[PDB]
Amino acid sequence: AGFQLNEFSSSGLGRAYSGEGAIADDAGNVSRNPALITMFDRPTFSAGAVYIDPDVNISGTSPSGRSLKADNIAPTAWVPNMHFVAPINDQFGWGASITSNYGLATEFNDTYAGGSVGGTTDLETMNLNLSGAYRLNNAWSFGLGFNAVYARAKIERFAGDLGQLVAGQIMQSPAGQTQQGQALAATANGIDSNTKTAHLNGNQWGFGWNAEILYELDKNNRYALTYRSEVKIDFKGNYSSDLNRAFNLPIPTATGGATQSGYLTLNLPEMWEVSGYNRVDPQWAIHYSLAYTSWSQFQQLKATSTSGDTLFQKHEGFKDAYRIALGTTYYYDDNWTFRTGIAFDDSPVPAQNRSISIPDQDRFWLSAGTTYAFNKDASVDVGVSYMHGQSVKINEGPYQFESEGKAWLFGTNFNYAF
Numbered sequence: 393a394g395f396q397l398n399e400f401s402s403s404g405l406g407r408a409y410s411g412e413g414a415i416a417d418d419a420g421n422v423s424r425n426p427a428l429i430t431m432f433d434r435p436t437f438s439a440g441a442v443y444i445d446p447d448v449n450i451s452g453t454s455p456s457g458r459s460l461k462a463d464n465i466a467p468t469a470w471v472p473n474m475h476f477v478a479p480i481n482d483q484f485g486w487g488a489s490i491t492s493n494y495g496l497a498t499e500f501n502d503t504y505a506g507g508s509v510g511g512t513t514d515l516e517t518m519n520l521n522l523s524g525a526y527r528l529n530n531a532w533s534f535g536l537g538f539n540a541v542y543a544r545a546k547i548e549r550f551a552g553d554l555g556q557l558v559a560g561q562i563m564q565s566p567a568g569q570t571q572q573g574q575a576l577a578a579t580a581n582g583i584d585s586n587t588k589t590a591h592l593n594g595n596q597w598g599f600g601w602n603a604e605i606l607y608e609l610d611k612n613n614r615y616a617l618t619y620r621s622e623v624k625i626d627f628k629g630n631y632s633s634d635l636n637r638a639f640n641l642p643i644p645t646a647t648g649g650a651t652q653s654g655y656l657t658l659n660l661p662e663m664w665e666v667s668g669y670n671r672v673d674p675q676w677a678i679h680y681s682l683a684y685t686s687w688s689q690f691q692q693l694k695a696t697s698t699s700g701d702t703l704f705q706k707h708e709g710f711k712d713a714y715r716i717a718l719g720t721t722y723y724y725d726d727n728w729t730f731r732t733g734i735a736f737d738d739s740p741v742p743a744q745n746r747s748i749s750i751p752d753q754d755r756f757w758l759s760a761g762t763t764y765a766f767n768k769d770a771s772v773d774v775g776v777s778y779m780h781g782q783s784v785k786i787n788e789g790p791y792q793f794e795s796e797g798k799a800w801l802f803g804t805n806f807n808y809a810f
């Protein structure tokens with residue numbers, strides 16, 4: 393998953409988010425799978441957070457001989473979640489929740505030789521969801537939900553050695569000797585590492601909806617199909633570039649540092665997910681899922697000026713991708729519950745499109761969790777998950793890098809009910 397997040401509950405973390413639309417042992421699940429609402433016969437609560445500790449690294453050498461060693465470019469994060477589910481009557485119930493389905497944060501040193509293709513990239517996302525559900529009969533249930541997505545993002549790029557590279561090019565071609573071509577490679581080579589090559593930031597809201605059909609063969613077996621609509625966010629922020637208005641080459645529009653309104657449309661992929669849950673035995677349940685995310689909808693990142701011109705652009709060309717997950721839950725005794733999960737979700741970025749801003753790659757999830765219930769009305773969820781990613785090669789601009797990533801997740805949630 394590119395800039396997607398799966399941390400909506402601590403229970404799901406311990407089970408590697410496998411079959412999340414077919415399980416409902418705690419309120420956290422109905423946040424992304426509405427129909428599960430008809431699985432609760434009483435007001436239920438849950439709140440907590442997942443701490444993410446990534447270890448992402450970039451390596452390589454610039455044509456300028458300088459090092460492209462970006463060490464630990466992914467900051468640690470806390471992704472909170474909060475859930476409420478309540479029955480209206482015997483046929484209807486609803487739910488509310490706050491979670492985060494998208495996010496990203498990559499930051500290099502502004503003196504990094506790769507400044508032009510990697511400086512600072514941040515995307516914070518908050519999703520407010522109000523849902524409702526209807527239970528046709530003992531087998532079928534229907535869930536509808538509306539979402540309010542808030543997103544704050546900030547992109548800033550610099551110039552690593554581009555000045556030295558272009559200046560070195562201007563001094564290798566015939567136009568080198570020219571007292572004009574040299575006063576050109578003296579200016580180019582002049583630009584410092586930390587020279588804000590671009591700056592975009594802004595906040596905005598997007599809206600979307602959910603639909604799920606839950607089918608249960610019985611009290612111990614059910615399967616489900618859920619639709620998560622795409623969400624477009626039309627930002628309206630601030631753009632600028634410290635490069636002299638003169639420089640206006642495949643460079644972002646220079647504004648001599650001045651700021652001007654900027655417009656950008658972020659496309660958050662829609663999602664389809666089929667899942668099942670099998671309570672094979674009084675104490676064991678098996679849960680699995682396949683998720684299809686159409687990252688195709690995220691074709692680019694283009695910034696427009698009020699006038700309509702392009703101030704900043706970056707091709708992304710993402711392809712739809714799948715996430716596969718298998719896990720099991722051990723309902724030990726009235727007090728203890730244990731869970732494991734393994735999962736694999738392949739990155740939607742084609743090798744040809746990879747960039748150091750989203751050091752993304754195929755991922756392996758291995759996870760474990762436990763749940764202590766204090767009395768059937770209160771419980772705590774503790775989950776842990778290990779993430780390791782495929783190491784890949786990146787060709788961006790004149791540079792060539794190589795990145796690898798691994799991450800650890802710890803999460804805690806407290807549950808309550810009446």
Ligand SMILES: CCCCCCCCCCCC[N+](C)(C)[O-]
Binds near residue numbers: 545708
């Ligand atoms: C006018 C400002 C518009 C805000 C620009 C915010 C873009 C957030 C996109 C995050 C995706 C990260 N990526 C593609 C750059 O690696």
